């Protein structure tokens, strides 16, 4: 469960991210494709080169979903419901991959939040992305 | 992956009793039922609407025969799994875009099917040997993924 | 989430286990120690030899906990509250191992329930053990 | 796992800037904060009750120095990680009873610590190189587990 401190930490971190959310989402995907090449199997229709507009556009959408999740941190299953449907029944991304993207989002946040990425905030963000991942896979079966 | 000589003997002996077409259809069917996201590769296969429809689907059964046939052949080369499955690894990465986690899920389902099929004959030591094998095959099929 | 059909399937399958619950628990543990030897790092205080009283005793405790969960499948968090506490605060078994024991329980059930282990029941049992595992790790952080 | 010559250069270049003592304490501290069940191996280490207590704990810092020191030594040895860590692998299995999953967790935390400390310099290709490295070290340390 996300604690009140977790929720405070997540809002603070994501708030500092602010308008860079989309750029950081794209960076996290890029990190994912390089660090965990098997994740590329879900994007054969993308140019996955550095600076790809397709990766940039998808990163914007991922980031916006996370912003929406933060804004509904007490009511995340409904906020993410359409994305839970989409991943469960259309995209059908193996659940194992959400941990990979979550790690890469954490790494991206670390690389951009020198002041904010304390051990406590680190822990909260890890819990939050695991929670988002759990919601996103909740309708798989 | 490294099997002992007795483990290799155990694998070979049990597999000699396997109807590969039958166990292949059963394992692939159960994969699509237990882990339904794996259905994403098989939109062309027709009716997958229920467990009975999946298990009874002749295209599901056909691909099951094909996959487990290749698995079976690979058991002749337990000393070279990486090399034995290298060209299939390339194909699954380059053209089929199959997440290697699918290979691990199928290995797990295969172990369940063997346990169901063989009952008490599927002893804890025989299972451990087969776990090494399905891990090794999954690792071999994943090796070329760049 | 566990559907009504999942609950029906689990109750029927585990009902058949009946008096063998402890035996099957011990067998699952032995299968786990042999197939996934890293799990032995949590039992250096046990005689892990085949047929040991320690492994038989622990198998029975694991099995009874599962019977408790099956009997209270509508509210497993409350049913397993003491056990969730124990694993989170004291045993601190890494969450990855719960999937290993769950796979070995599933294999043990498959080997003893030829009539009952249908594809649908297979799926339901896998979901149920994953749900139990989620409850037992829910308080880890 | 095997690193590209260019991945090796990226690893070596970044590590020349790493204060192994400090990064080591930071990484072990964060492991105990982010994945607090890992504190199970450090019962005698004193106060671990809050994040500030964990990070400031002298025994945590000292052990972090020790652990990352051995990590560092291994980076001279990237084509032979299994041989390099064989002795410590046996120790962790036989004497310390440490689940090798802990090595993967520490690997993840170390990558986060490097990103946090180095910022933009920790580029996606440099991270990718370090992921291969921490995976290889974790695998090498898990290798002797029987
Ligand atoms: C925090 C985790 C994730 C979030 C918030 C997220 C969110 C999203 C969003 C918002 C979309 C666009 C939906 C639309 O346009 O209707 C999307 C699509 C997609 N996602 Fe996820 N996702 C996550 C994890 C993943 C992972 C781990 C993978 C695979 C490695 C993945 C693969 C895809 C793919 C292939 C698409 C379609 C892309 C396209 O063809 O345009 N997602 N996701
Ligand atoms: C032991 C594991 C596996 C083995 C040995 C194996 C082997 C094979 C073989 C021999 C082929 C035919 C290649 C050709 O015609 O050139 C094939 C094709 C294919 N495989 Fe795999 N496979 C395995 C697992 C999987 C899994 C788990 C999936 C997806 C869930 C999968 C998806 C596919 C697909 C979509 C094709 C193309 C089928 C077609 O074109 O009709 N495979 N595989
Ligand atoms: C997945 C379902 C699991 C269930 C239902 C379960 C249940 C239990 C129960 C009922 C106990 C005894 C509690 C007591 O005596 O008050 C116990 C203890 C214990 N469990 Fe879990 N457990 C599970 C998973 C695991 C896993 C995966 C591991 C490690 C691989 C583990 C490691 C332990 C250990 C080391 C003890 C103490 C054993 C002893 O000293 O007697 N458990 N568990
Ligand atoms: C991943 C890279 C790691 C390396 C290279 C490493 C290396 C070492 C070394 C050199 C020692 C000293 C052994 C001696 O003096 O005989 C040690 C001890 C120890 N390590 Fe590891 N270690 C690693 C990860 C871990 C992790 C992640 C954990 C647990 C979370 C762990 C648990 C321990 C424990 C409990 C000791 C004994 C500490 C004591 O004296 O109380 N190690 N390790």
Coordinates of C-alpha atoms in Angstrom, one line a residue, chain D:
Chain D
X1 CA 27.1 -12.2 -20.4
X2 CA 29.8 -10.5 -22.5
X3 CA 30.5 -6.8 -22.9
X4 CA 31.3 -5.0 -26.2
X5 CA 34.8 -3.3 -26.2
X6 CA 32.9 0.0 -26.3
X7 CA 30.8 -1.1 -23.3
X8 CA 34.0 -2.0 -21.5
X9 CA 35.4 1.5 -22.2
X10 CA 32.2 3.2 -21.0
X11 CA 32.3 1.1 -17.7
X12 CA 36.0 1.8 -17.1
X13 CA 35.7 5.6 -17.9
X14 CA 32.9 6.1 -15.5
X15 CA 34.5 4.0 -12.7
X16 CA 37.6 6.2 -12.8
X17 CA 35.3 8.9 -11.2
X18 CA 33.7 6.6 -8.6
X19 CA 34.6 7.0 -5.0
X20 CA 34.2 3.3 -4.2
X21 CA 33.9 3.8 -0.5
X22 CA 31.3 6.4 -0.7
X23 CA 29.2 4.9 -3.5
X24 CA 29.4 1.6 -1.7
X25 CA 28.0 2.9 1.5
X26 CA 25.3 4.8 -0.4
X27 CA 24.3 1.8 -2.4
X28 CA 24.1 -0.7 0.5
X29 CA 22.2 1.9 2.6
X30 CA 19.7 2.5 -0.2
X31 CA 19.3 -1.3 -0.6
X32 CA 18.3 -1.5 3.1
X33 CA 15.9 1.4 2.8
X34 CA 14.2 0.6 -0.6
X35 CA 14.0 -3.2 0.1
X36 CA 13.9 -3.3 3.8
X37 CA 13.5 -7.1 4.0
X38 CA 17.2 -7.1 3.1
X39 CA 18.0 -6.0 6.6
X40 CA 17.5 -9.6 7.6
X41 CA 21.2 -10.1 6.9
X42 CA 22.4 -7.3 9.1
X43 CA 20.8 -7.9 12.5
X44 CA 24.0 -7.0 14.3
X45 CA 24.6 -3.7 12.5
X46 CA 22.8 -1.5 15.0
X47 CA 20.2 1.2 14.3
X48 CA 18.3 0.6 11.0
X49 CA 15.0 2.1 12.2
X50 CA 14.7 5.1 9.9
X51 CA 16.2 6.1 6.5
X52 CA 18.5 8.6 8.1
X53 CA 19.7 6.0 10.6
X54 CA 20.4 3.5 7.9
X55 CA 22.3 5.9 5.7
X56 CA 24.4 7.2 8.6
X57 CA 25.1 3.8 10.1
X58 CA 28.8 3.3 10.3
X59 CA 28.6 -0.5 10.0
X60 CA 26.4 -0.1 6.9
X61 CA 29.0 2.3 5.4
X62 CA 31.8 0.0 6.3
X63 CA 30.2 -3.0 4.7
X64 CA 29.2 -1.0 1.7
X65 CA 32.9 -0.1 1.3
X66 CA 33.8 -3.8 1.5
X67 CA 31.2 -5.0 -0.9
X68 CA 31.7 -2.4 -3.6
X69 CA 35.5 -2.8 -3.2
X70 CA 35.1 -6.4 -4.3
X71 CA 32.8 -5.3 -7.1
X72 CA 35.4 -2.8 -8.2
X73 CA 38.1 -5.5 -8.2
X74 CA 36.0 -7.5 -10.5
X75 CA 35.8 -4.8 -13.1
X76 CA 39.4 -5.6 -14.1
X77 CA 38.1 -9.0 -14.9
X78 CA 35.0 -8.5 -17.1
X79 CA 35.7 -11.5 -19.3
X80 CA 36.0 -13.8 -16.3
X81 CA 33.4 -12.8 -13.8
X82 CA 32.5 -16.4 -12.8
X83 CA 36.1 -17.2 -11.9
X84 CA 36.6 -13.9 -10.2
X85 CA 33.7 -14.3 -7.8
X86 CA 33.8 -18.0 -7.4
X87 CA 35.2 -17.9 -3.9
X88 CA 32.8 -15.2 -2.7
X89 CA 30.0 -17.1 -4.4
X90 CA 30.7 -20.2 -2.3
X91 CA 31.0 -18.0 0.8
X92 CA 27.6 -16.4 0.3
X93 CA 25.9 -19.8 -0.3
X94 CA 27.7 -22.0 2.2
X95 CA 28.3 -19.6 5.2
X96 CA 26.2 -16.5 4.8
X97 CA 23.0 -18.1 3.3
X98 CA 22.3 -15.1 1.1
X99 CA 19.5 -15.5 -1.5
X100 CA 21.2 -14.4 -4.8
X101 CA 18.2 -12.3 -5.6
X102 CA 19.9 -9.8 -3.2
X103 CA 22.7 -9.4 -5.7
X104 CA 20.2 -8.4 -8.4
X105 CA 18.5 -5.9 -6.0
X106 CA 21.9 -4.4 -5.1
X107 CA 22.7 -4.2 -8.8
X108 CA 19.5 -2.2 -9.4
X109 CA 20.2 0.2 -6.5
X110 CA 23.8 0.7 -7.6
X111 CA 22.6 1.7 -11.1
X112 CA 20.1 4.2 -9.5
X113 CA 22.9 5.6 -7.3
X114 CA 25.2 6.1 -10.3
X115 CA 22.4 7.9 -12.1
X116 CA 21.7 10.1 -9.1
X117 CA 25.3 10.9 -8.5
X118 CA 26.4 11.5 -12.1
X119 CA 23.3 12.9 -13.6
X120 CA 23.3 13.5 -17.4
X121 CA 26.7 11.9 -17.7
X122 CA 25.1 8.5 -16.9
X123 CA 23.7 8.3 -20.5
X124 CA 21.4 5.5 -21.8
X125 CA 24.4 3.7 -23.4
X126 CA 26.5 4.0 -20.2
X127 CA 23.6 2.7 -18.1
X128 CA 23.1 -0.2 -20.6
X129 CA 26.8 -1.2 -20.1
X130 CA 26.4 -1.1 -16.3
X131 CA 23.3 -3.2 -16.4
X132 CA 25.2 -5.9 -18.2
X133 CA 27.9 -5.6 -15.6
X134 CA 25.7 -5.8 -12.5
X135 CA 23.8 -8.7 -14.1
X136 CA 27.1 -10.5 -14.8
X137 CA 28.3 -9.9 -11.3
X138 CA 25.0 -11.1 -9.8
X139 CA 25.2 -14.2 -12.0
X140 CA 28.8 -14.9 -11.1
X141 CA 27.9 -14.6 -7.4
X142 CA 24.9 -17.0 -7.8
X143 CA 26.9 -19.5 -9.8
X144 CA 28.2 -21.8 -6.9
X145 CA 24.7 -22.1 -5.3
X146 CA 23.7 -25.7 -5.0

